[PDB]
Symmetry: C3
Subunit: 172 residues, 3 copies
């Protein structure tokens, strides 16, 4: 077990190659362990990379990258999750109340087409890349039918001849 | 390498101070390797904490906190993801069918304003924060246009006179 | 410290037990430390599993599983997250631009009832016959009110001439 500090990370076919100081430990270190979480920090950024030696052989040293210590989120009690490796306020939380995500902009899909924003507590859903079709038995807004089964009542006309509720939305 | 049990965890500027028993290995075993996933367990939990010493130096020790042994989910074949640290029901799964999130409630945004729930197969989308605005070339419920371009057919009045299709929704 | 390949993973009450190919080092091995992220690979998969021993005692030794490196994602600079352990294009990214999820299908809830798709930007939201109820001070589409507070102007009767706007959508 030994301790060194990160400078440079490069990609290859079978993992990531890093140079982590501690003298010129190696220009191209043996690939790093992922275990599910990985990131690509910028060149020469504060963070530390522990190296584990295969047996006692100095020829093999797997790194264990860690989030920068200035940027570790102080999670609340009985909570956990993952976070942006360079900021403590863009994270994902799985709690006893609800699956909580925090960020100033949300996106989904292959090409980030489905974009959702919660700016100022409002809702701005943007999917301008195509059509929007919803399936649901009976739709509301504030508990009032606004979907495919609503009808608009009429009122008195110029001749005073009252009318009834109009027909539902047209079918193409 | 050595194994230990968890006693108490408190936050710190550049890590997480933890007591791990083992005859009191240290009142604050400051280092806690953070590779993306972390949590703040309650005092005196069943989970087991391993300690790793920098080289052979017994002064420096790094902890590797683990999910409690008695609360580990049994994932299905060809699946993986992160889970609620203290329960096997609230989790996230990335599979060959769909990005699956399981929980009894859903919240988003900076202050959980955008709240979504899925109870008893139903859908309850709450955005009490404020206004809701959607951008899309269409809005079709069950495949029927109810968006900004729908229009209502009209029927005969008390005078027997038939009108034409209604105008689109009023524009502010 | 040693390094080996994965052979077969079996579930058990105390955790997940995996047998590796260290000359049959153990058919019923010490479990895989579950630091949040875990997965259940198919039998005889190519991935590689390390193994550490509690102290120098060879009787007990924990292993740490790694994502197979032929399916390792090459994250962009200033980015990180978790991925599908068997594919590099099914992942979640927490960036400095937006919380990004990539997948051909999206599901939520206890039983995947709330299903969302973003195929070709053609947003398709399916609730499996559920009751979609939305709460918001004002619902809009393309910047036009189509919610619970929209009204429809109408046309001129035949011998009845003009008339006022319609009533709001019918209540239940």
């Amino acid at each position: 077990f030994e301790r060194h500090v990160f400078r440079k990370l490069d990609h290859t076919d079978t993992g990531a190659i890093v140079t982590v100081e501690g003298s010129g430990t190696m220009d191209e270190d043996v690939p790093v362990i992922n275990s599910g979480y990985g990131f690509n920090p910028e060149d020469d950024e504060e963070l530390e990379v522990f190296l584990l030696s295969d047996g006692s052989d100095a020829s093999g040293k797997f790194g264990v990258m860690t989030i920068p210590r200035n940027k570790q989120r102080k999670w609340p009690k009985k909570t956990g999750g993952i976070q942006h490796p360079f900021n403590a306020d863009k994270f994902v939380q799985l709690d006893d109340d609800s699956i909580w995500l925090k960020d100033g902009k949300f996106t989904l899909g292959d090409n980030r087409s489905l974009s959702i924003t919660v700016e100022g507590n409002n809702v701005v859903i943007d999917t301008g890349g195509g059509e929007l079709d919803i399936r649901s038995s009976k739709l509301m807004h504030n508990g009032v039918n606004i979907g495919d089964s609503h009808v608009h009542p009429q009122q008195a006309d110029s001749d005073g001849d009252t009318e009834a509720d109009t027909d539902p939305p047209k079918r193409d």
